[PDB]
């Protein structure tokens, strides 16, 4: 993951790239117990995800601490666009 994180389309002004598609990661507190959700681990798990596409880059789009998830007392999830900026 030499997977770069841009953050910002801004940033993108005149490179062109090619979208590989969405990609996310996410940190899990499955319990009260537990240690709070990773928001660290869920950028660093969407740009593994990226880089498993063979991506370059990451456009970050968002992340959110969540109460809802499924298997989670709390996650935090991060979500973006792989990309080969070529």
Do not use: W
């Given at each position: 993951?030499p997977?770069?994180?841009?953050?910002?389309?801004?940033?993108?002004?005149?490179?062109?790239?090619?979208?590989?598609?969405?990609?996310?990661?996410?940190?899990?507190?499955?319990?009260?117990?537990?240690?709070?959700?990773?928001?660290?681990t869920?950028?660093?798990?969407?740009?593994?995800?990226?880089?498993?596409?063979?991506?370059?880059?990451?456009?970050?789009?968002?992340?959110?601490?969540?109460?809802?998830?499924?298997?989670?007392?709390?996650?935090?999830?991060?979500?973006?666009?792989?990309?080969?900026?070529?």
């Amino acid at each position: 993951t030499p997977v770069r994180i841009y953050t910002n389309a801004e940033e993108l002004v005149g490179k062109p790239f090619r979208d590989l598609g969405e990609v996310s990661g996410d940190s899990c507190q499955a319990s009260n117990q537990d240690s709070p959700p990773s928001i660290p681990t869920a950028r660093k798990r969407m740009q593994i995800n990226a880089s498993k596409m063979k991506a370059n880059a990451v456009l970050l789009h968002s992340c959110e601490v969540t109460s809802g998830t499924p298997g989670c007392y709390r996650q935090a999830v991060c979500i973006g666009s792989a990309l080969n900026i070529t």
